[PDB]
């Protein structure tokens, strides 16, 4: 839930997008 879109829940990327 920290970057663009991708891993980490279904919201925002896992930082290292």
Keywords summarizing the entry:
17 residues, little secondary structure, globular, 0% strand
Which SSEs are present, and which pair or pack?
Elements: no helix or strand
Question: Could you describe the 3D structure shown?
Answer:
With 17 residues, the chain is largely without helices or strands. The chain contains no helices and no strands. It is globular, with a radius of gyration of 5 Å. The N and C termini lie close together (11 Å). The PDB classes it as unknown function. Keywords: lasso peptide, class IV.
- Main sheet attributes: strand count, strand direction, barrel closure: none
- Shape field: globular
How many DSSP-defined strands?
Answer: 0
Strand fraction band?
Answer: under 5%
Computed CA radius of gyration, to the nearest angstrom:
5 Å
Q: In angstroms, what separates the terminal alpha carbons? A: 11 Å
Number of helices: 0
Alpha-beta content class: little secondary structure
In helices, the fraction of residues equals: under 10%
């Amino acid at each position: 839930g920290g970057g663009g879109r991708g891993y980490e829940y279904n919201k925002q990327c896992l930082i290292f997008c």
